[PDB]
Structures are given as C-alpha cells and as structure tokens.
Write an enzyme that holds these catalytic residues in place. Sequence first.
Site, PDB file in Angstrom:
ATOM      1  N   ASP A  36     -13.483   9.092  68.521  1.00 47.16           N
ATOM      2  CA  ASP A  36     -13.706   9.602  67.166  1.00 47.16           C
ATOM      3  C   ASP A  36     -13.003  10.941  66.901  1.00 47.16           C
ATOM      4  OD1 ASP A  36     -14.630  10.027  64.589  1.00 47.16           O
ATOM      5  OD2 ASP A  36     -16.738  10.282  65.164  1.00 47.16           O
ATOM      6  N   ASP A 232      -8.513  10.234  61.065  1.00 47.17           N
ATOM      7  CA  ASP A 232      -9.830   9.901  61.617  1.00 47.17           C
ATOM      8  C   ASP A 232      -9.917   8.502  62.222  1.00 47.17           C
ATOM      9  OD1 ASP A 232     -12.502   9.886  62.282  1.00 47.17           O
ATOM     10  OD2 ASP A 232     -13.243   9.785  60.215  1.00 47.17           O
TER      11      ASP A 232
HETATM   12  C1  LIG Z   1     -16.414   8.909  59.340  1.00 47.87           C
HETATM   13  N1  LIG Z   1     -17.198   9.065  60.572  1.00 47.87           N
HETATM   14  C2  LIG Z   1     -18.515   8.805  60.677  1.00 47.87           C
HETATM   15  O1  LIG Z   1     -19.264   8.408  59.779  1.00 47.87           O
HETATM   16  C3  LIG Z   1     -18.953   9.098  62.122  1.00 47.87           C
HETATM   17  C4  LIG Z   1     -19.961  10.273  62.109  1.00 47.87           C
HETATM   18  C5  LIG Z   1     -20.904  10.278  63.335  1.00 47.87           C
HETATM   19  C6  LIG Z   1     -21.930  11.422  63.139  1.00 47.87           C
HETATM   20  C7  LIG Z   1     -20.112  10.568  64.640  1.00 47.87           C
HETATM   21  C8  LIG Z   1     -21.631   8.911  63.424  1.00 47.87           C
HETATM   22  C9  LIG Z   1     -20.716   7.683  63.349  1.00 47.87           C
HETATM   23  C10 LIG Z   1     -21.132   6.435  63.893  1.00 47.87           C
HETATM   24  C11 LIG Z   1     -20.290   5.293  63.836  1.00 47.87           C
HETATM   25  C12 LIG Z   1     -19.003   5.385  63.232  1.00 47.87           C
HETATM   26  C13 LIG Z   1     -18.130   4.266  63.135  1.00 47.87           C
HETATM   27  C14 LIG Z   1     -16.734   4.386  63.361  1.00 47.87           C
HETATM   28  N2  LIG Z   1     -15.909   3.335  63.239  1.00 47.87           N
HETATM   29  C15 LIG Z   1     -16.465   2.163  62.891  1.00 47.87           C
HETATM   30  N3  LIG Z   1     -17.769   1.937  62.640  1.00 47.87           N
HETATM   31  C16 LIG Z   1     -18.609   2.980  62.752  1.00 47.87           C
HETATM   32  C17 LIG Z   1     -18.592   6.637  62.688  1.00 47.87           C
HETATM   33  C18 LIG Z   1     -19.432   7.781  62.744  1.00 47.87           C
HETATM   34  N4  LIG Z   1     -17.678   9.530  62.700  1.00 47.87           N
HETATM   35  C19 LIG Z   1     -16.760   9.481  61.794  1.00 47.87           C
HETATM   36  N5  LIG Z   1     -15.431   9.804  61.948  1.00 47.87           N
END
Ligand SMILES: CN1C(=O)[C@]2(CC(C)(C)Cc3ccc(-c4cncnc4)cc32)N=C1N
Length: 402
Positions: A36, A232
């Site tokens: 991420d 991202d």
């Molecule tokens: C935009 N973004 C988010 O909403 C987040 C925030 C975080 C708090 C880390 C929790 C989370 C959990 C799953 C996904 C995910 C990623 N890819 C596919 N499905 C779910 C993405 C994210 N990390 C990012 N970059």
Amino acid sequence: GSFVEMVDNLRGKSGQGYYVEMTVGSPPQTLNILVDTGSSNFAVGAAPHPFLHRYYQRQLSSTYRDLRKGVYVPYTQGKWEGELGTDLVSIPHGPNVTVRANIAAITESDKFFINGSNWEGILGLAYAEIARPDDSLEPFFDSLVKQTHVPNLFSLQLCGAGFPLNQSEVLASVGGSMIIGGIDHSLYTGSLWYTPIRREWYYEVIIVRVEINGQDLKMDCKEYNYDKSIVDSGTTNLRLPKKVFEAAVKSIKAASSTEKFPDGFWLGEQLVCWQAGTTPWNIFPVISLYLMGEVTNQSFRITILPQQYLRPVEDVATSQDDCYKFAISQSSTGTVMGAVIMEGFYVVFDRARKRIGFAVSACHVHDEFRTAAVEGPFVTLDMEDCGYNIPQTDESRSHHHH
Ligand SMILES: CN1C(=O)[C@]2(CC(C)(C)Cc3ccc(-c4cncnc4)cc32)N=C1N
Ligand code: NI
C-alpha cells in the site's frame, strides 16, 4: 540491474489489492501483506476474524516487544485498531535482511479485511507524515533503510488480468513484482521517465495536462491536482476530481457512442459484456496523463488503454461472455493513480532522489494496434504552477514539529 529472487513475488485477486509474503516474529510467522503506497502503517491481523484463517500471534514470538500504546485508525470505508509493538520482520522473497519494525497488532476492525483477498495485513509504504497515531511511529521502509544497507528505493510492476479467464467461480488471480532496493531492467522496455515527489507524505505528484484520445481536456491544470494527485497501489481505480471525472466521462462516452451503456456502467455499479473475444477495444479512447518533468518546463505523458480502465469480471451466469467494470471513478480528495494506472507501467519509487519513475511494463495488457506508453519530453514555454495548496486548518497549524 537484476533481482531474480524478487521477481513475481506479488499475488492477489482482481480488485482486492496486491500482497507480498512477509514474516513477523521469532521463529518467523508467515502472513500475506497488502502492498500500500497510499498509507504508512505496518498493521497486521492479530486476533481471530471471520475473514482470517491465520493471524500474528504475539505470544509465539520470543522477540516481540509491547510498546504499551494503542492506535485507532478510522477512514472513509471503516476502521482498524490495535496495540503498537515491535518485532523482527523479513520479506522471504525480498532482500536477505531482517529488521526490527513497528507493528500495529489489529485487535478490532470494521470493513478492513476482505473475504477471499487472502491478505492478513497492510504494508504502508508512504511517509511518516501520514503514519498513525502520529509521525513519530517510524514506517517499515524507513526502518529497513536505517537498519540495513538497502538503498532507499523500491519499484512495483503490477500485472493485471485478461480474458480468457481461467475460473467462473472465483475472481481472477493477479501477479507482479516488488523490487526492494533497486530497478530490474527485465521488468520494463523503453525509457524510464521521472516526475518529482512534490511532498513526502503520500507519493504526491503533479499532473500538468490530460488528454482523452489525443484531445486536451483544456482545464486549469490545478483542477487535475485538486486537492492532490497521488500514486496509490492501495486503490484499484483511476480516481479523478469531480470536475475532471465529469469531463473525462463525457469524452469517453462520445468516443464509444456506437454503444449505449446504462448509467450504472459509468458509475462503476454495473458490468457490460460482449461475446468472448469480441470486445470492441477500438471504440474506447486512450487516456494520457502528462506529469511534471524533473526539468522546469518539461513534462512526459503516460498513456493507458481501455484494457487498463475496463476491469475484467467473469460472471457465473454469463461465463460465455467477457464482462467489464468501468474502473474510473469520482474523487473528492484529489487524483488517485491506482492499480488501473500502475498496471500499465513499471513504477519506481525513488525515495532517495524524491522522484517517481514510469516506464512501459513488460507485462501490461494490450492489443496489436495500441500499447500503454511513456513518452517525452514535452516542453511548455512558461509552464504554469499546477499544484494546489490545501487550506491550512488551525489544528494542523497548531502542531509542533520537533
Ligand atoms: C485508498 N486506500 C485505502 O482505503 C486503504 C486505507 C487503509 C487504512 C490502509 C485501509 C485499507 C484496506 C484495504 C484497501 C484495499 C486496497 N486495494 C484493494 N482493496 C482494498 C485499502 C485501504 N489504503 C489505501 N491506499
Ligand atoms: Ni513545542
């Protein structure tokens, strides 16, 4: 420029993120961890959950240390929370090193874990400024670089899926590479072009121009970066600021007008299908994002295909057909170059030199007529400032930074 051991070390399910195998604790406990670049915490499931078949068991690790501090992280979709600690961490298909890193042990969450995604935690690769509870919690990559001789750079080759799809019951499997500490020349072709990291928090960049099938959107370029533009890996879609999204959808609609899709399709809430192998790719336009160059007055463009922004989803009832989700969506928090963009390119997060590199990916999905491209330079006489300055809140201003 060869990192064979790290090639093909990423896996995942389409739309559910790319993960790398990591180990935590002594002896090593294997977990699959979402890569991420849009967050900055190393946070792992550490209690039973319906969607986890395994989790980090702190009591099994001789080297675990409790930091006696909790962490609470709400976000748009949901929340995760837990206990801060440190332990030994390695990446088995990464560099031959072990580091002591901060680990947030997730004890309670809502809409964090995804049923069937096969990952149990998240590796936030962005900078300390957006770490939780605050910027004093050292992110994983910072610890890796400080404790080892690993160069301050990583690169991502995200390889998407394509028809014919193997399975009708499960989502399409995806693969890719995270090269830690280097650039693997086998992962790209052609030139590698760099855009500056505007500020080290997210991987923030500046878009100076947008074209849809070679047609300029002709907007004030600040609109492209309102209120930021970021790269991202933790976002599936290309996400665009409201005004830009509307302009893009209008242009793509016009180019593809021979077909009349429901409103649901353009909102990403409905699939459209064609008989297997007959998808009319040529009616959908290419999308070019021009990124600020390292040189003043220069830019380069990255160009993506409908093979990137139309996501393949095999339906159980319609398994004879090729069906797609429109993967460009509206944002109120700026441009997000997610997996849709990244799947076209080898992407170099050159933290050492405060820049992000793009080159055509050796694995991107294309056809015989068109390819994803990275092209430049483009010179602009007296190029404007396309960056947006986020209004400063009192709470933000009140922070001391010692
Ligand atoms: C935009 N973004 C988010 O909403 C987040 C925030 C975080 C708090 C880390 C929790 C989370 C959990 C799953 C996904 C995910 C990623 N890819 C596919 N499905 C779910 C993405 C994210 N990390 C990012 N970059
Ligand atoms: Ni002070």
